[PDB]
């Protein structure tokens, strides 16, 4: 269940969170903020000799645990939750190196008797949340060890933990009883489905228990010589879903002839792709006439030979490569005798954030974004903090290198993303961000928000086929992983900056008559107050589209206001997005640009998080030819197809919006429709 994964999540939360809390407590982070409370990042890193980059990662984690509040001046303060640091006894760090492999084999004595008593005791803590963190340090190593021999199973053919010495039985039983992994029914231990499930999924946390050495020198990472030191399966299920779609397309003639996975690793991804294609798709039934060659790419020869072994009975090829240089790939593929790169489907899985960092190259594009409120945290080889806007700018030119190699078959990219501390806390144990974000930042990997990554592709002409693109975690209001099947499109989409006001005013006049143009004052307001609420569609360096939006407290706040008082609907902590306007030059209408721009903005607002719906008040264009009938009977009309007659309301409704009501005298100056504005809402379903 999700609830059990949450228990797993908070076990692995402490595995990472505890070393750093202790490290911060020893250098005096908490004692400091006990004084001089309001402090900046730079204020502290100077007063502590910290590595600003890695130390910021610690702050994000601590804020995400709501031990620190970060004010609008960006300075931190303690919270009441932060007082519990005093009772985390230091010696718990000894858990990371105990010989539990041998222990289960009966050759370490009563190794885990003193801890298990302290875990049965609430680690002498009056806080169940931290007691689960501490339990992690014991729990994580055990499950890994218990998993090498599937030791956690019910008591039918192997009575639960019956192969083991008397003491191991006694100690583990006392523990599994405390943690609820087993019940002593009928005077004999029998696992609980929690215990069973805790042992089955035991490898989710274990796999990333490889953080141990960095965690042991985490005090170095934060305050000393940091330089010396350096799991859903439906991620891939949906990835396979979109592969079938690609290899069931109309003519086999036009399916990709190559599938190149950047970041082969062991090659498991490629092999799963081929079996999906082999046994399920249409291509799999015509491989003798339309061969398909897998291609593996990776910069470590180690994993290059691991995929030669994995793909060994499969038509494949292997070569060395790097994400940062997609142009060497076509040339290496040229060297390996592939002269039709346009017939390659490109895929990759969770590596763009592990690219070798290039500094940003287009300094004007750097400064446009230097005020946007990114909440990426990233660290340089010197251990200092990289400004978010530099990283994102870096990301864009990284994506542009690839956009210039992407072909008709597109670019299918899974990727992982970080989260705002305020959101991590709200969903602390529903997501694994706290430890994953904390480590991937300590490890000099580069995580950005999902909305920002998708935007980064947008600004270079890469756009997700929303049909084959999926978001995760599906049923929560945050995006932590994205499956995007980026298409290359002949345009670009980007944020509107104040520099764009001249053209956006010119835009507003070419799209509407004077009595319907948006006030220049309004447009200025939209840009200044909604930096990430304004999307622009650029073709050949000119703006040809623009969708405006802001955040509102509710749809009920709207539906009770006139167009003139919209600016007074703005609420920064709103759970709904107001669609302010959708302007497309008449020269370039009837092309789908407006349709695509609309679809993109909706998905952009889904990845931001915390937005249940997108609503707006639109106009009718052809009521003035039917005004004899009421609006509501006109809105009911249908064109030659099964779509609404009116092209404006038609456009939003076809795009999935539902007409929610009519607003009387919303736009009085709109004489054609008698001042009536038609409210709309978009599903926005997960
Ligand atoms: N910058 C880069 N360019 C290309 N491949 C990269 C890369 N950085 C890392 N990789 C690849 O990503 C993979 C590491 S993850 C593979 C390990 C495997 N999943 C396991 O758990 O056992 C390796 O193939 C490595 O070569
Ligand atoms: Mn990584």
320 contacts 296 by C-beta, under 8 angstroms: no
Confirm or reject: Cβ of 354 under 6 Å from ligand 1: yes
Q: Alpha-carbon distance 278 to 310, whole Å? A: 16
Tell the residue number behind the tokens 């990776």, with chain if given: 298
273 contacts 237 by C-beta, under 8 angstroms: no
Q: Residue 258 pairs with which residues in a beta bridge? A: 293, 344
H-helix or E-strand spanning residue 649: helix 647-654
Q: Which DSSP state fits 293?
A: E
Q: Which residues are within 8 A (CB) of 8 and not within 5 positions of it... i.e. 6 or more apart?
A: 198, 201, 204, 205
Residue nearest atom 23 of ligand 1, based on CA coordinates: 265
Cα(266) to centroid of ligand 1, in Å?
8
Confirm or reject: Cβ of 299 under 6 Å from ligand 1: yes
Give the gyration radius of the chain's Cα atoms.
28
Cα(157) to centroid of ligand 1, in Å?
40
Residue nearest atom 21 of ligand 1, based on CA coordinates: 207
Q: Please state, as a whole number, how many other Cβ atoms lie within 10 Å of the Cβ of residue 422.
A: 15
Q: Which of 163, 144, 142, 155 is nearest to 182 (CA)?
A: 155
197 SS3 class: helix
**Per-position b or e across 121-145, b if 16+ CB within 10 A of its CB:** ebbeeeeeebbbbbbbbbbbbbbbb
Q: Which residues are within 8 A (CB) of 654 and not within 5 positions of it... i.e. 6 or more apart?
A: 643, 644
Q: Where in the chain is the domain with CATH 3.40.630.30?
A: 493-682
Q: Would you mind telling me the total number of residues written for the chain in this entry?
A: 686
Cα(542) to centroid of ligand 2, in Å?
37
Confirm or reject: Cβ of 267 under 6 Å from ligand 1: no
Task: Give, for ligand 1, the residue of 308, 326, 354, 413 to mutate: max count of ligand atoms closer than 8 Å to Cβ.
Answer: 354
Phi first, then psi, for residue 345 (nearest 5°) are -85, 125
Residue 432, token pair as written in the block: 């694994």
H-helix or E-strand spanning residue 537: strand 534-539
Give strand ranges (E) for 255-356: 258-262, 293-298, 318-320, 344-349
Chain centroid offset of residue 158 CA? 42
Enumerate the known binding-site residues for S-adenosyl-L-homocysteine.
Answer: 265, 298, 322
SS3 letters across 658-673 = EEEEEECCCCCCCCCC
Inter-axis angle of helices 166-179 and 113-120, nearest 10: 20
Q: Alpha-carbon distance 359 to 371, whole Å? A: 18
Tell the residue number behind the tokens 């690609």, with chain if given: 246
75 contacts 45 by C-beta, under 8 angstroms: no
Confirm or reject: Cβ of 300 under 6 Å from ligand 1: yes
Residue nearest atom 13 of ligand 1, based on CA coordinates: 265
Return the residues preceding each gap in the chain, C–N over 2.5 A, or none: 230
Confirm or reject: Cβ of 89 under 6 Å from ligand 1: no
Cα(350) to centroid of ligand 1, in Å?
9
CATH class of 493-682: alpha beta
Q: What is the dihedral of CA 216, 217, 221, 226, to 10 degrees?
A: -150
Tally helices (H) and strands (E) across the chain. 26, 21
H-helix or E-strand spanning residue 281: none
583 contacts 507 by C-beta, under 8 angstroms: yes
Residue 268, token pair as written in the block: 């498991």
Task: Dump the DSSP string for 88-139.
Answer: S-GGGGGGGG--HHHHHTT-S-STTHHHHHHHHTTTT-S-HHHHHHHHHHHH
Confirm or reject: Cβ of 263 under 6 Å from ligand 1: yes
The data reach a resolution, in angstroms, of 2.6
Residue 471, token pair as written in the block: 């978001």
Confirm or reject: Cβ of 319 under 6 Å from ligand 1: no
Cα(437) to centroid of ligand 2, in Å?
10
Q: Which of 452, 444, 434 is nearest to 375 (CA)?
A: 452
Q: Residue 481 pairs with which residues in a beta bridge? A: 416, 472
Cα(635) to centroid of ligand 2, in Å?
51
In terms of Cβ atoms closer than 10 Å to its own Cβ (0-12, 13-18, 19+), residue 575 is middle
SS3 letters across 213-240 = HHHHCHHHHHHCCCCCCCCCCHHHHHHH
Q: Which DSSP state fits 83?
A: G
Residue 493, token pair as written in the block: 């989409």
Confirm or reject: Cβ of 328 under 6 Å from ligand 1: no
Task: Give, for ligand 1, the residue of 209, 210, 233, 303 to mutate: max count of ligand atoms closer than 8 Å to Cβ.
Answer: 303
Q: Alpha-carbon distance 222 to 596, whole Å? A: 46
Question: Which ligand 1 atom sits closest to the C-alpha of 302?
Answer: 26
Q: Residue 680 pairs with which residues in a beta bridge? A: 616, 659
Cα(129) to centroid of ligand 1, in Å?
34
202 SS3 class: helix
Experimental technique for the deposited model? X-ray
Phi first, then psi, for residue 130 (nearest 5°) are -70, -35
CA distances from 465 to 442, 481, 486, 599 (A): 33, 16, 6, 10
Cα(140) to centroid of ligand 1, in Å?
24
653 SS3 class: helix
Q: Alpha-carbon distance 531 to 24, whole Å? A: 35
Q: Alpha-carbon distance 634 to 615, whole Å? A: 21
Q: Please state, as a whole number, how many other Cβ atoms lie within 10 Å of the Cβ of residue 38.
A: 11
Q: Please state, as a whole number, how many other Cβ atoms lie within 10 Å of the Cβ of residue 306.
A: 19
206 contacts 11 by C-beta, under 8 angstroms: no
431 contacts 371 by C-beta, under 8 angstroms: no
Confirm or reject: Cβ of 260 under 6 Å from ligand 1: no
Confirm or reject: Cβ of 298 under 6 Å from ligand 1: yes
Chain centroid offset of residue 380 CA? 22
Confirm or reject: Cβ of 445 under 6 Å from ligand 1: no
Cα(74) to centroid of ligand 2, in Å?
28
Q: Which residues are within 8 A (CB) of 39 and not within 5 positions of it... i.e. 6 or more apart?
A: 32, 33, 47, 75, 76, 77
Q: Rounded to a whole number, what is the distance in angstroms from the first to the last CA of the chain? A: 19
Phi first, then psi, for residue 576 (nearest 5°) are -140, 150
Q: Residue 494 pairs with which residues in a beta bridge? A: 536
β-bridge pairing 293-298 and 258-262: parallel
Enumerate the known binding-site residues for Mn(2+).
Answer: 353, 440, 445
Residue 579, token pair as written in the block: 């669609």
**Per-position b or e across 256-265, b if 16+ CB within 10 A of its CB:** bebbbbbbbb
Q: Residue 682 pairs with which residues in a beta bridge? A: 614, 657
Dihedral angle sign, alpha carbons of residues 76, 82, 83, 88: negative
Q: Which residues are within 8 A (CB) of 685 and not within 5 positions of it... i.e. 6 or more apart?
A: none
Q: Which DSSP state fits 75?
A: -
CA distances from 209 to 101, 102, 387 (A): 14, 18, 29
Q: Alpha-carbon distance 506 to 517, whole Å? A: 10
Q: Alpha-carbon distance 588 to 256, whole Å? A: 31
Give strand ranges (E) for 242-389: 258-262, 293-298, 318-320, 344-349, 378-379, 385-386
Cα(298) to centroid of ligand 1, in Å?
7
Q: Alpha-carbon distance 411 to 205, whole Å? A: 30
Chain centroid offset of residue 62 CA? 20
Q: Which of 402, 439, 386, 416 is nearest to 260 (CA)?
A: 402
Confirm or reject: Cβ of 382 under 6 Å from ligand 1: no
418 contacts 424 by C-beta, under 8 angstroms: no
Q: Residue 348 pairs with which residues in a beta bridge? A: 262, 413
Residue 385, token pair as written in the block: 């903090």
Tell the residue number behind the tokens 């600003």, with chain if given: 52
Confirm or reject: Cβ of 301 under 6 Å from ligand 1: no
Phi first, then psi, for residue 154 (nearest 5°) are -75, 170
Q: Residue 545: left if φ>0, alpha if ψ -120 to 50, beta else—which one?
A: beta
Largest CA distance in the chain: 92
Q: Alpha-carbon distance 439 to 434, whole Å? A: 9
Confirm or reject: Cβ of 398 under 6 Å from ligand 1: no
Q: Which of 447, 438, 485 is nearest to 353 (CA)?
A: 447
Q: Which of 346, 296, 349, 299 is nearest to 322 (CA)?
A: 299
Apex 326 CA angle, 324 and 328, nearest 5: 105
506 contacts 545 by C-beta, under 8 angstroms: no
Residue 334, token pair as written in the block: 């040229």
393 contacts 60 by C-beta, under 8 angstroms: no
Cis peptide bond prior to 461, omega within 30° of 0: no
384 contacts 421 by C-beta, under 8 angstroms: no
11 contacts 135 by C-beta, under 8 angstroms: yes
Enumerate the known binding-site residues.
Answer: 265, 298, 322, 353, 440, 445
């Amino acid at each position: 269940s999700n609830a059990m994964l949450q228990k797993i999540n908070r076990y692995t939360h402490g595995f990472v969170a505890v070393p750093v809390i202790l490290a911060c407590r020893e250098k005096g982070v908490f004692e400091l903020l006990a004084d001089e409370s309001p402090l900046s990042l730079n204020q502290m890193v100077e007063h502590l000799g910290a590595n600003s980059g890695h130390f910021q990662v610690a702050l994000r984690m601590l804020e995400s645990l709501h031990w620190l509040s970060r004010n609008k001046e960006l300075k931190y303060s303690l919270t009441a939750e932060a007082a519990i640091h005093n009772k985390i006894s230091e010696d718990i760090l000894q858990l990371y190196n105990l010989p539990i492999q041998s222990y289960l084999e009966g050759k370490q004595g009563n190794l885990l008797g003193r801890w298990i008593e302290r875990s049965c005791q609430l680690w002498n803590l009056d806080n169940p949340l931290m007691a689960d963190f501490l339990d992690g340090l014991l729990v994580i190593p055990l499950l890994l060890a218990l998993h090498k021999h599937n030791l956690l199973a019910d008591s039918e053919d192997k009575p639960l933990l019956s192969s083991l010495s008397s003491t191991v039985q006694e100690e583990l039983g006392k523990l599994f009883l405390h943690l609820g992994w087993a019940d002593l029914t009928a005077g004999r231990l029998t696992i609980t489905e929690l215990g069973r499930f805790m042992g089955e999924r035991a490898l989710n946390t274990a796999i990333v228990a490889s953080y141990t050495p960095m965690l042991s020198r985490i005090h170095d990472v934060l305050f000393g010589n940091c330089l010396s030191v350096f799991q859903h399966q439906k991620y891939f299920a949906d990835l396979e879903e979109s592969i079938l779609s690609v290899f069931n397309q109309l003519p086999l003639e036009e399916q990709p002839k190559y599938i190149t996975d950047m970041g082969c690793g062991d090659g498991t991804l490629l092999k799963r792709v081929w079996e999906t294609i082999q046994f399920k798709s249409a291509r799999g039934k015509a491989l003798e006439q339309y061969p398909l060659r897998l291609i593996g790419v990776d910069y470590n020869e180690a994993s290059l030979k691991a995929t030669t072994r994995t793909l060994a009975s499969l038509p494949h090829l292997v070569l060395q490569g790097d994400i940062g240089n997609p142009e060497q790939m076509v040339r290496s593929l040229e060297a390996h005798g592939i002269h039709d790169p346009e017939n390659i489907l490109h895929i990759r899985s969770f590596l763009d954030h592990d690219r070798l960092f290039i500094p940003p190259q287009k300094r004007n594009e750097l400064k446009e974004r230097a005020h946007l409120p990114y909440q990426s945290v990233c660290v340089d080889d010197q251990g200092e903090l990289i400004p978010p806007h530099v990283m994102v700018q870096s990301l864009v030119e990284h994506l542009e290198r690839w956009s210039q190699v992407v072909n008709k078959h597109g670019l299918m990219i899974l990727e992982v993303h970080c989260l705002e501390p305020r959101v991590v806390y709200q969903f602390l144990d529903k997501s694994e961000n706290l430890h994953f974000d904390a480590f991937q930042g300590f490890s000099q990997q580069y995580l950005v928000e999902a909305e920002v990554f998708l935007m980064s592709a947008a600004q270079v002409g890469l756009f997700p086929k929303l049909e084959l693109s999926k978001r995760y975690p599906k049923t929560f209001p945050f995006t932590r992983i994205t499956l995007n099947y980026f298409e290359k499109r002949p345009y670009k989409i980007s944020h509107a900056y104040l520099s764009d006001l001249p053209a956006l005013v010119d835009l507003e006049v070419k799209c509407w008559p004077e009595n319907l143009r948006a006030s220049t004052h309004e447009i200025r307001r939209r840009l200044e107050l909604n930096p990430q609420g304004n999307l622009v569609l650029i073709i050949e360096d000119q703006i040809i589209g623009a969708i405006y939006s802001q955040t509102i407290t509710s749809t009920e706040a709207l539906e009770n206001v006139k167009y003139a008082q919209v600016p007074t609907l703005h609420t920064p902590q709103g759970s709904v997005i107001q669609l302010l306007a959708l302007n497309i030059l008449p020269e370039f209408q009837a092309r789908g640009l407006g349709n695509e721009l609309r679809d993109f903005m909706l998905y952009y607002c889904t990845l931001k998080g915390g937005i249940e719906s997108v609503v707006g008040v639109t106009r009718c264009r052809n009521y003035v030819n039917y005004s004899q009938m009421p609006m509501m009977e006109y809105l009911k009309l249908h064109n030659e197809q099964r779509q609404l007659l009116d092209p404006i309301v038609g456009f939003h409704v076809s795009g999935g919006a539902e007409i929610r009501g009519i607003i009387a005298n919303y736009r009085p100056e709109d004489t054609d429709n008698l001042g009536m504005g038609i409210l709309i809402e978009y599903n926005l379903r997960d």
